[PDB]
Amino acid sequence: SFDRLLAENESLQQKINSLEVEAKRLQGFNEYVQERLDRITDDFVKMKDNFETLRTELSEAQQKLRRQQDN
């Protein structure tokens, strides 16, 4: 009577193979990336803000240093 669900039984098992291999491996990667997703941000976003300071300063500094840079 419930023979179609039996036909789906062999279908489920093989269909899940694509899922268990995918979702799990994914989670491992998402676990890995999450570490650097946060860690990179700080050193990145802060160093950009910190970079403009060094940039403008040095950018003018360089034009003056080419005149007298410990000379």
Added chain:
Amino acid sequence: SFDRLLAENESLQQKINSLEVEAKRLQGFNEYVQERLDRITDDFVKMKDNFETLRTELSEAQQKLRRQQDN
């Protein structure tokens, strides 16, 4: 006869709910993150190498500029 597989039939369907919702959503995130994983790297790794140059230069530049910075 194959009644146990029928018992597993109702088990498969409900077990896959946790997978289809997980793996797929994951893939969407991994698709998203992949864009920034590469994009951040360049601006990050290169700006670090570029930062040491600006750092040392300005670091000495600042000590000289406090003597004469367009004065």
